[PDB]
Amino acid sequence: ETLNGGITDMLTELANFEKNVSQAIHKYNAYRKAASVIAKYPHKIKSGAEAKKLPGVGTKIAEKIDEFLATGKLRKLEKIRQDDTSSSINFLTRVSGIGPSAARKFVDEGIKTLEDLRKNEDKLNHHQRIGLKYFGDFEKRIPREEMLQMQDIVLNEVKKVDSEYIATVCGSFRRGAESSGDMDVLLTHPSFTSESTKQPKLLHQVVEQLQKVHFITDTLSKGETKFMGVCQLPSKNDEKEYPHRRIDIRLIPKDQYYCGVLYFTGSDIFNKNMRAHALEKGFTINEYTIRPLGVTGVAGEPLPVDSEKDIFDYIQWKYREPKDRSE
DNA sequence: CATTAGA
DNA sequence: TCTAATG
Ligand code: NA
Ligand code: NA
């Protein structure tokens, strides 16, 4: 956590680099397990050798450990950091739409800068057009103060269209968070669950609603169960307009909400942990259900969930307010 | 890890 | 169809 730090940090820098600038999935994956393992290690790694005894700890990495140990640096690290090309890839990637693959290809052609990107908005697809457009607003944090604003409105039309809908705004937002990156609406309806062959409209109707009023301003992607877009809070009585916000709304069988909700609310640690517990407690937890464990090794049969509680109760735990789902 | 664009 | 990008 801090004794293993530099090494893990360097190693991660290292993986990441292969993965993006290069297309070295393997090495990348090498750097990572190592980074994983050296990380677990209970002692100060004092040399490559010591490190090396580890699993996944090859000669190439160990070698890298020494140089890092001896001098507070690493050439290859220094070299890459410098690399205008590699820098370019890292950068372009921030555009929402742009991944490593496109990142390379773009560079290839010579689009390294934002400006470049613009000059060639044609080379870009709708997703990346928008990504490009709201580049600033997309990088910006979301004050909870706004979160409430957005949350508010959302619930309004939701109910507006059909009183029957149920939306929850999952994430850190839900976990008290002074700020969030994007809003996550989990949605369901009773007229939709596990079997009941959809009602795509269900998603549709609302998106439409949200748009109708001007909350939704752009569609990044809309499928029959996962809408991915942009939104914005009415710019008041002028002088102050709102940043374009990332928004995602997903449909869900009313028969899987709570777990889903449970789940997407986190935190990542709380989940894991809770999850780990449900195991002792003879269960199985996952994004959609909760199954009773059978001795043979495994088992099925999704226990019925009406609220975040049911799940709790099931595993017989203390209902934890989202507030304190921190871990 | 599953869902959507796209080509 | 596969292959990329999101989360
Ligand atoms: Na080894
Ligand atoms: Na990106």
Q: For residue A222, what is the domain's CATH number?
A: 3.30.460.10
Based on the domain organization, do A198 and A255 belong to the same domain? yes
Q: What are phi and psi of A114, to 5 degrees?
A: -60, -45
Based on the domain organization, do A74 and A145 belong to the same domain? no
Based on the domain organization, do A29 and A77 belong to the same domain? yes
Which ligand has the nearest atom to the CA of A54?
1
For tokens 């979301």, name the residue.
A142
Resolution in units of Å: 3.1
Question: Is A318 known to be catalytic?
Answer: no
> What range does the domain containing A305 cover?
264-326
Give the largest Cα separation in chain A, rounded.
Answer: 66
* Three-class DSSP category at A6: helix
Rounded to an integer, what distance in angstroms lies between the CA atom of residue A53 and that of residue A195?
Answer: 52
The answer to whether strand C lies under 7 Å from the CB of residue A20 is no
Rg (CA), chain A: 24
The answer to whether strand C lies under 7 Å from the CB of residue A101 is yes
- Is the distance from CB of A232 to CB of A187 less than 8 angstroms? no
In the PDB record, what is the listed experimental method? X-ray
User: What order do you get walking across the sheet with A166-170 strand by strand?
Assistant: A166-170, A183-188, A245-250, A226-231, A216-222
Task: Sort residue A134 into left (φ over 0), alpha (ψ -120 to 50) or beta.
Answer: alpha
Based on the domain organization, do A172 and A257 belong to the same domain? yes
- Is the distance from CB of A7 to CB of A61 less than 8 angstroms? no
The answer to whether strand C lies under 7 Å from the CB of residue A103 is yes
Rounded to an integer, what distance in angstroms lies between the CA atom of residue A264 and that of residue A236?
Answer: 32
Cα torsion for A152, A175, A185, A256, to the nearest 10°? -130
The CATH number linked to A136 is 1.10.150.20
Give the residue from A83, A105, A128 where a domain finishes.
A83
Omega of the bond leading into A307 within 30 degrees of 0 (cis): no
Based on the domain organization, do A192 and A114 belong to the same domain? no
